[PDB]
Amino acid sequence: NSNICEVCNKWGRLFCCDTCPRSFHEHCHIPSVEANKNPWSCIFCRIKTIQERCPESQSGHQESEVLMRQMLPEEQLKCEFLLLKVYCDSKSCFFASEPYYNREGSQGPQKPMWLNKVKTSLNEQMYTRVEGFVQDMRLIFHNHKEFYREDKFTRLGIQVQDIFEKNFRNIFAIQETS
Ligand SMILES: [Zn+2]
Ligand SMILES: [Zn+2]
Ligand SMILES: [Zn+2]
Structure with missing residues (x-):
């Protein structure tokens, strides 16, 4: 090992x-x-x-069908694995713990979200469909992009979202498209 x-x-x-x-x-x-x-x-x-x-x-599968799946044991496992693939990137550190927002010219998000919160939610079986998990994951990056505006730090949200999205398409066998 x-x-x-x-x-x-x-x-x-x-x-x-x-x-x-x-x-x-x-x-x-x-x-x-x-x-x-x-x-x-x-x-x-x-x-x-x-x-x-x-x-x-x-x-190949359609994203809209995947999102509507109920969180039976195989889909629970697939979401756990996707979450773990995000933690595998070192840049996940920025998104792991609870954020706070005090930057001149910006207002914090209405619904904060972070990886450890998604982790607790999976562990507690709080998601009934794949859509609930994917929506919270995408919200992490969307909140970041909106708050950091033109600061170059916005790019960290783009980078980690791209890791999430590539792994989402792999793990749930999303149909390849141009
Ligand atoms: Zn193994
Ligand atoms: Zn079979
Ligand atoms: Zn470790």
Whole structure:
């Protein structure tokens, strides 16, 4: 197994996947690495299994159909994995914890949102459809773009949104388009 966390790329107290060489901090993995379970298989491995059990699940889908899906166990897992892919980028640090807004010439968003809040919401089964999770994720970046206006820091929101959107299209097998 790897000697660094797959998510944050640091060493420490690491839990190793039994079916692949990846390793994780307890609260870096999503869901948090389970207490017992021998063997244990990481989220990467669990997602690969879904694909292998239903190869047709990789055929293209429309975003509007994906969003309306209920959060059954496979969709819960896919949203957890998508959230984890965002944490995998170091620039997610800017979006992880609760933000505050005091900048001359700007007013904070009406509905603040942050990655750890989405993480708690998934853990607490607060989303009934994929649409609820995707709307909160996109709101993070939209709030950032609106608040930072012409400051070059706006670009951090564009960058992390692009990581979210590419992974969304991959994980939910969105139909490729020009
Ligand atoms: Zn970690
Ligand atoms: Zn694994
Ligand atoms: Zn099948």
